[PDB]
Design a protein around this ligand. Structure first.
Ligand SMILES: [Cu+2]
Ligand SMILES: [Cu+2]
Ligand SMILES: [Cu+2]
Ligand SMILES: [Cu+2]
Ligand SMILES: [Cu+2]
Ligand SMILES: [Cu+2]
Ligand code: NA
Ligand code: NA
Lengths: 439, 439
């Protein structure tokens, strides 16, 4: 096949993407070994769905797992009656998700399970795939002529030819695996044919962070989780927390081989030590550096000019309420809280008004990084840790280091009951989730 | 003094730059040796004059040379009754140049002799200096916060402690020297204090070309000879022909030492060979690579963002005439022609109308590069060699390789008699010059 593996793409046809997926245990070859994973569509990652605004998506999910499951359409501003975090599809049963892609939307999204208490083992075992919303902006020459690739960043650990089970420490930290894969492949080679690459990046890991840096090159950020920036932003590295997405342009500077690496990053994961008295929790410290892929540049590369502008960010109405959400941890219990409470699906925590704008101040009073995710209602990050964000774009996950406050502008869109939660999915399963009702 | 030598600056005071310079043989230390050069203001290069639009310049030139001389205000769109190419200042005499700096003007200009038949030895001996027109655009943060430096690129050859005399081959080729200097210094070190540098570049050499490249870095072109571009243009290298100027931003990428080099370039200079029968002219081939300066980057450099826009280029009226000027050579005679004729100060070659726009097609039917210069009337280069120019900016010198046609939009500004000529100044002295009269 092609030097660079990417998930098979399913495209809408005549404005309709009608597809039946099965969630199923699937024997496959992965990273040179045979394993049985849980997959959508028989592959890991699942198929990439590629749609345009105003397309109809009709996705029938058949549950062939031994436990109930459902789908979260991560990042899509659609109705929580479709993107329903409380729905359960029993083993052997099917459910059809049907929605229209919003008109004012573009970027890289993804789908994965969201059945409270079961997300972390299901996602870790292989249940996820990407969804791309194509834009009329992709026809501008500076993007159309770039070489486009999707990079699904997801790690894995195998034991006896199956995903390794969760340990107690995994529930506290979030589980990371030793196989650090791109599109399910171990350190693939990307032999570039053009001098400008457009890379869609997805962190679909349970808990692993990717401090991305390409040897000898900057990255040009052009989209965040849920939409384009207003203009490209040059960065020397890009941190992608669990659930985040980004699109970058890479402008290859000379012939040669360049490593794309996940540089060392300390997210506050903890271990246990005994040195006499004891035993106490001790920081694991920074992650070991990983090579994600080998990028081979073409001969005499002459990159395109960057686009001057991308998409103007909407002017938002003045906000009508300020919320404060405080994240805390009980690490030894592996319990995680928002404003002192664990998730209860019967309890509404916040009540807001559709088509108003809110300011959410999310404060991490824990010691671990927590990537905060809100369903249904994309937000504008104003500042994190007191530092203003250097761009305007729609996001739906924001990473908070220990002690940091994020200030978020949140336009409330579709009415209904939805959730917000940590996207270290073990922490969500262990209670770090709350309920928003929009009326 | 400072690690990086630059000419002393004279600034206008209260809207007036009133200065008396003397053109004088001057003993000095240069490149570690003692030599007697011909200088303005006792220095090599002469002092940098720094003015703003609408300033008055009152420059009294005292001629203390043993031959007549004058000044050309290279690149300034002022009256040819001030910038007078036919004026002669006899030895011992003085002349006052007085003019107002045009309102719509910015960039790096320069001054040097323009007495036909004597330019090449006078310029080679050290008579030149820079003139900077400051702009309100220099207050935008992306320029104001850059570290600014002027680089006067000029080579020299010394013999018996004086500039080496011209040989017959020098009159044919244009004279180049073995001492390849920046601001009169041999391979200086620039220890950058900021991560973004703004470098004003001036080729004040008689004939040497500078194929500029900074190790490991692109250059961001922001101004041509006579004004800003509309937006920065990224280039991997920049060819600066005799008389050309440019301004570039340099965005230092990492700590370290980076060479600024004049890479090998073949301008078509000729030598003589005898291999049996013979003797015939033979190409000299490309220049040897030269190191111009050592650039030391600061610790943890974080360059500013580039400016998004610089100056919009004026919309010009539709042209009313097309001219064709053909350059040819008689190399063994060291004679050079425009449309088959050598310069005659009594003969008007072109007659144009003030405030109209002309298209000039300048065609190099020789084998050497010829950098074509027009006094008084800056032009827009549309294309050279059939390739469209990638930016809009005012220029006053355009380099033509063998066979190439340059297409130039030339708005005629001040009335009066002026000249156009090759800026390999030996070729001008040997006849490659003509007369334009604007009425
Ligand atoms: Cu998600
Ligand atoms: Cu968390
Ligand atoms: Cu969720
Ligand atoms: Cu000149
Ligand atoms: Cu010439
Ligand atoms: Cu001239
Ligand atoms: Na299947
Ligand atoms: Na003097």
């Amino acid at each position: 096949g092609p030097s660079f593996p990417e998930p098979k793409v399913v495209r809408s046809q005549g404005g309709l993407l009608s597809l039946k997926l099965s969630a199923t245990p699937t024997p496959l070859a992965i990273a040179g070994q045979r394993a049985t994973l849980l997959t959508y569509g028989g592959s890991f990652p699942g198929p990439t769905l590629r749609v345009r605004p105003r397309d109809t998506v009709r996705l029938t999910l058949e549950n062939r797992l031994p436990e109930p499951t459902n789908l979260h359409w991560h990042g899509l501003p659609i109705s929580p009656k479709v993107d329903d975090p409380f729905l359960e599809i029993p083993p052997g049963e099917s459910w059809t998700y049907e929605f229209t892609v919003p008109k004012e939307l573009a970027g890289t999204f993804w789908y994965h399970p969201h059945l409270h208490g079961r997300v972390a083992p299901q996602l870790f075992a292989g249940l996820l795939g990407a969804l791309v919303v194509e834009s009329s902006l992709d026809a501008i020459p500076e993007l159309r002529e770039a070489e486009e690739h999707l990079l699904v960043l997801k790690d894995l650990a195998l034991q006896g030819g199956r995903p390794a089970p969760h340990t107690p420490m995994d529930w506290m930290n979030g589980k990371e695996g030793d196989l650090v894969l791109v599109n399910g492949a171990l350190r693939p080679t990307l032999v570039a044919q053009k001098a400008t690459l457009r890379l869609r990046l997805l962190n679909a890991s349970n808990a692993r962070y990717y401090r991305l840096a390409l040897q000898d090159h900057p990255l040009y950020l052009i989209a965040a989780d849920g939409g384009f920036l207003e203009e490209p932003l040059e960065v020397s590295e890009l941190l992608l927390a669990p659930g985040e997405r980004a699109e970058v342009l890479v402008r290859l500077r000379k012939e040669g081989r360049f490593l794309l690496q996940a540089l060392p990053y300390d997210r506050g994961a903890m271990g246990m030590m005994d040195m006499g008295g004891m035993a106490h929790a001790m920081p694991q410290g920074p992650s070991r550096p990983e090579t994600l892929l080998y990028l081979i540049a073409p001969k005499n590369p002459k990159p395109l000019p960057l686009p001057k502008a991308l998409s103007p960010f909407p002017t938002l109405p003045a906000p009508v309420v300020t919320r404060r959400l405080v994240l805390t941890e009980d690490m030894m219990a592996a319990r995680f809280f928002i404003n002192g409470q664990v998730f209860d699906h019967r309890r509404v925590d916040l009540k807001g008004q559709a088509q108003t704008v809110e300011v959410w101040e999310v404060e991490n009073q824990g010691d671990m990084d927590h990537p905060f995710h809100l369903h249904v209602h994309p937000f504008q990050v104003l500042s994190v840790g007191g530092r203003p964000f250097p761009y305007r774009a729609w996001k739906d996950v924001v990473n908070l280091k220990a002690g940091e406050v994020a200030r978020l502008l949140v336009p409330l869109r579709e009415k209904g009951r939805t959730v917000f939660h940590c996207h270290i999915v073990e922490h969500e399963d262990r209670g770090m989730m709350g309920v928003l009702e929009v009326g």
